[PDB]
Structure formats: structure tokens, C-alpha cells
Nucleic acid binder design. Structure first.
Lengths: 49, 44, 163, 49, 195
DNA sequence: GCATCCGTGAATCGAGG
DNA sequence: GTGTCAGTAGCTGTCACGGATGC
RNA sequence: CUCGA
């Protein structure tokens, strides 16, 4: 299972957080299975339904 | 004599290209024969 | 239907939230290492999911069964696999250092051996620096001999120097 | 301007003038400058090596 | 997921961030940041400047941000994590061996769980432990509480091999120990010449 | 938009147990 | 194979400083 | 750990 390199997550400033515009705390919840995250959403199908 | 020293992110492919094999088993050695267990952290 | 395959999970996640955070503390006190406790907890609960004959009787204490499962696994780790190794750590301030000798002798020996090689003939040389009879294109008795006489010239030179 | 210098970054006043030398002669806009004082620690971490 | 699962896709853990990096247009976000930079309030401009400093790196250098998520971890050669024997018949081992060993254990358990179809809760709560263990291997203690060894002693990580006075850089590179050298007490020798 | 809190740093060599 | 309560030690007696982190 | 400039 893929895993994140702590240096780029927790190291300040959170490099991943800067790359994805994701807050460090949100990213922490994501990586350590505290919250789900939406990868993709078919907005057109949703509009049509 | 070598001019530059480059550093960058290691691709998964680079990590696999370095390794001479995967460490499957978690064993270290045998505490009687002092021989390293196969596919362990000391696999010969 | 599919609701049942989901009911399996919804049944496990309901014992987690009530027994995992407590089982952890037990293995913690018994091992003094939260990491191994984290491991043992998952091992235990996996077995639990594998032994449904225990949670089915909801009205009975399940935690009580879990504690014994864990308590047994910990000592299984205190088995022969622990007695020999668990002692020290290299980076722990209290262990020596793998020290390698100073190559003085070996180097002086080879420096002499190299000085009693200029005192040779190129053929004795090519033979000593190597069954060889297959390459150099000579007999095996020629080998045996050239080896013999060459080694004796070498011993002669060496003892001439006072070895 | 026409340089690849990330605005807000602190760059040695030699490379700045050399790069604006090439760009001024190239037709593009030379990067703007403003003298900046750095403490010894921060300048030491900013070395090219 | 039970209601509107056909319209979106969601995930958890580190694999999800891997996916996010995959579905990410580096150049586009870089240009969005530059547009914010050309004309913006300092309050909301410093944040964008510092973000560009990161994104433009991946943009120019031609290395993918996917590198920040690992599919395989390297194992340091054995002589740099040596295992020595004690004069009492027992053994002492480098801390890296304990860390690598814990990581290997959790990884093989993840393989088992994936094969056995364990409940999703166990698989995810195991992936989290693998994450924490690789975090410890690389920079133990960086996040939260360190991995205690025997005696509630924090174990040394790979990144602990380099920091400070005892790190490789300052201890074994900027200053070595040298052959052909000695030391002793000093005494004044008045009859000596200056040279 | 601003206070909190995180992470960084903190002399050199040397002896013995 | 496992099945009645069955649940850390230790510890805050450092500090100045900058800046991302967070309400 | 204890110690010397």
C-alpha cells in the first residue's frame, strides 16, 4: 500500500500541503485514516441527474 | 575528479533499480548457526 | 444480498470502538512497548474476526476472551526468538565498535612477497599468479614442477632476507 | 520581468545583474531589484551549495 | 457512497494523496499562482509566493511530485546497521534493524489481510500503522510520540544519523580522527628556541 | 487578519568505569 | 488452544526566536 | 556516569 515520506508531510512547511493547497491538519487526517477525501466527481452526470 | 553532486527525489523505479532483491521475510539471523536467514534483513 | 456482506464490517467496527483501545493497554503494560502492542492488537482482532463462535453470543464477555488471546501471543514472542537478541543495541551508549585491525602486517608481508617476485622468471611468475595447465598450454607435471621449484626459489629468497 | 527568477526570492546581486544583462540585450524586460539585508544564519543557509 | 456513489470517487490514506498528485496539473496551478502574484494583496500574496516556490520546482526540474509517495522503501546495507555480539553470549543490534523489522512485520501483515479479505476497518487501521512505521524508519519522533525502545528510550532513525554534533556531517566529515598523532601534558621549556 | 505553537538552535578536546 | 473483574509510566524544574499553523 | 584544561 502506498505510503507518504514524512519529511515532505510533517516537515514545516508541509511540502504536500503547499503542492495540493491542503491544510497540514487536513492532510494529517487524510494520511492517518481519520477522514476520507474526494479524488474525483463526475460533475456533468450529477448535473444531468 | 568529478564536477557536480546532484540530488533529487527517488522514483519507485530508482528504488527498485538500486535494490539487489526484496526483503520478504522479517527474520534477521539464526542465533545458533550465526548464518543470515534467506530473504531476511541479511540475505546473502 | 449485499447488506449482509456489509453487516460483517458493521459488526467488526462495533467491537473495535469498544474493545481495541482497551486491549491495547493490556498488552502495553505487559510489554512496555506501544509499538508491539499496536501489532498484537491487530493480530488478536484479526483472529477474532476469524473465530466468530465467540462474538455471536453477544450476552457473554468477549473482552475476557480477547485478553487471554493477547497474553498468550506476547509470551510466544518471549520465546526462544527473544532470549538471544533482545539485549542491547549498537547505537546504545554501552556497546563496543566493530573495529578492524591496522593492515600493517599483511601489507609488509605482501611487500616482501613482491620483492621476491622480481627475483623470478616470467614463466614461474605467470604460473604462480594462477588446473592452470589448461591455459598456459603445458603439462600438469610441468605445473607441479614449476610450482615446486618456484616455491623453493621463493623460500630461498625469503630466508635469504632473514624471514 | 522576463527572468525565471521567482518573485520574492533572494538572489545574489551578481547573477541578478548577469541575467538582466542577457535579457536587456534579448529585448525582454529585466527583472526588478531591491537591496535586501540578510542575517548571517539565513545567508549561510542560502548558499548555492 | 450508499446513495450517490455512481457520481463521485473517494478514498483514504496515502493512496488517496497519490491519486490527488496524479490528477494534478502542475503547469496550470503554477500559472494560477503567478496570476495571483502579479496583482494581489500581500496578506494573500505571501502564501501564493511560497506555494509557487514549491510548485515551480516540480514544474521546471522535470521530476514528478509522485516521488513524495513511496511504493517501495530502500534497505540500507547491513554493515551500516551492524549486529555485534556481546562477551556474555548475547547479542546487540543497531536500532535501524528494529525499525526495519517492525515495518517488515506490518507490511507482511498487510499482505495477509489483503489476501484474506479482512474487514475494511482492519485493512485501513493496518495501513495507518504501516504509515506510522515508515515515518519512524525515516525520522522517528518527527510526528507525535517517538517509538520507545527498551527503557522508554527513543530509537535512532536514519535522519538521526545526520543531525547535530553526532551526525555524520559534523562528526565524521567536517572532522575525522587521524593516524600519526599523539597527545600529552605540556611543560615549559625555557631553554627552547621559538621554533 | 493575528495569536498560538511548532521547530530550530545552544564550545573544543581529553581519561576511566 | 485461548474465553466471569481482568486496562502505561512518566512527567514541565530550559529558553530565545522566527514563521507556518490554526481560530 | 565522574572528572581535567
Amino acid at each position: 500500500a502506498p505510503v507518504t515520506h514524512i519529511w515532505y508531510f510533517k516537515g514545516v512547511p508541509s511540502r504536500l500541503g503547499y503542492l495540493l493547497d491542503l491544510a497540514p491538519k487536513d492532510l494529517e487526517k487524510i494520511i492517518y485514516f481519520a477522514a476520507y477525501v474526494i479524488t474525483s466527481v463526475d460533475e456533468e452526470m450529477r448535473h444531468n441527474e | 575528479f568529478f564536477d557536480e553532486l546532484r540530488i533529487g527525489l527517488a522514483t519507485a523505479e530508482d528504488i527498485r533499480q538500486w535494490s539487489y532483491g526484496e526483503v520478504k521475510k522479517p527474520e534477521t539471523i539464526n542465533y545458533r548457526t550465526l548464518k543470515p536467514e534467506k530473504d531476511g534483513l541479511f540475505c546473502e | 444480498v449485499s447488506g449482509a456482506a456489509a453487516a460483517e464490517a458493521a459488526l467488526m467496527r462495533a467491537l473495535y470502538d469498544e474493545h481495541a483501545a482497551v486491549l491495547w493497554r493490556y498488552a502495553l503494560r505487559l510489554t512496555g512497548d506501544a509499538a508491539q502492542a499496536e501489532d498484537v492488537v491487530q493480530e488478536t482482532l484479526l483472529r477474532a474476526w476469524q473465530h466468530p463462535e465467540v462474538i455471536g453470543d453477544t450476552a457473554r464477555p468477549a473482552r475476557a476472551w480477547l485478553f487471554t488471546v493477547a497474553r498468550n501471543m506476547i509470551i510466544d514472542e518471549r520465546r526462544s526468538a527473544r532470549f538471544r537478541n533482545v539485549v542491547g543495541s549498537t547505537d546504545q551508549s554501552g556497546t563496543p565498535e566493530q573495529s578492524t585491525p591496522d593492515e600493517v602486517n599483511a601489507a609488509l608481508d605482501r611487500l616482501l612477497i613482491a620483492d621476491a617476485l622480481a627475483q623470478l622468471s616470467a614463466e614461474h611468475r605467470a604460473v604462480i599468479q594462477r588446473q592452470i595447465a589448461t591455459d598456459l598450454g603445458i603439462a600438469e607435471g610441468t605445473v607441479k614442477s614449476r610450482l615446486h621449484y618456484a616455491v623453493r626459489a621463493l623460500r630461498l629468497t625469503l630466508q635469504e632476507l632473514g624471514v | 520581468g522576463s527572468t525565471e527568477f521567482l518573485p520574492g526570492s533572494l538572489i545574489d546581486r551578481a547573477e541578478f545583474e548577469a541575467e538582466n544583462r542577457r535579457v536587456v540585450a534579448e529585448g525582454g524586460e529585466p527583472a526588478a531589484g531591491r537591496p535586501v539585508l540578510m542575517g548571517i544564519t539565513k545567508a549561510s543557509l542560502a548558499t548555492d551549495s | 457512497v450508499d446513495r450517490y456513489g455512481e457520481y463521485f470517487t473517494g478514498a483514504m490514506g496515502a493512496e488517496s494523496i497519490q491519486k490527488l498528485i496524479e490528477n494534478f496539473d502542475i503547469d496550470a496551478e503554477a500559472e494560477s499562482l503567478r496570476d495571483v502574484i502579479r496583482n494581489g494583496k500581500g496578506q494573500k500574496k505571501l502564501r501564493a509566493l511560497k506555494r509557487l516556490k514549491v510548485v515551480a520546482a516540480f514544474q521546471q526540474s522535470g521530476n514528478s511530485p509522485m516521488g513524495m509517495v513511496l511504493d517501495a522503501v530502500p534497505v540500507i546495507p547491513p554493515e551500516l546497521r551492524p549486529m555485534v555480539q556481546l562477551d556474555g553470549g548475547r547479542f546487540a543490534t543497531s536500532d535501524l534493524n528494529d525499525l526495519y523489522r517492525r515495518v517488515i512485520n506490518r507490511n507482511n501483515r498487510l499482505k495477509r489481510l489483503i489476501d484474506l479479505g479482512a474487514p475494511e476497518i482492519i485493512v485501513n487501521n493496518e495501513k495507518r500503522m504501516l504509515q506510522e512505521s515508515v515515518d519512524a524508519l525515516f525520522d522517528n519522533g518527527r510526528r507525535g510520540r517517538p517509538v520507545t525502545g527498551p527503557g522508554n528510550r527513543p530509537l535512532k532513525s536514519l535522519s538521526d544519523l545526520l543531525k547535530g554534533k553526532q551526525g555524520r556531517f559534523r562528526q565524521n566529515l567536517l572532522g575525522k580522527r587521524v593516524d600519526y598523532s599523539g597527545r600529552s601534558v605540556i611543560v615549559v621549556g625555557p631553554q627552547l628556541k621559538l621554533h
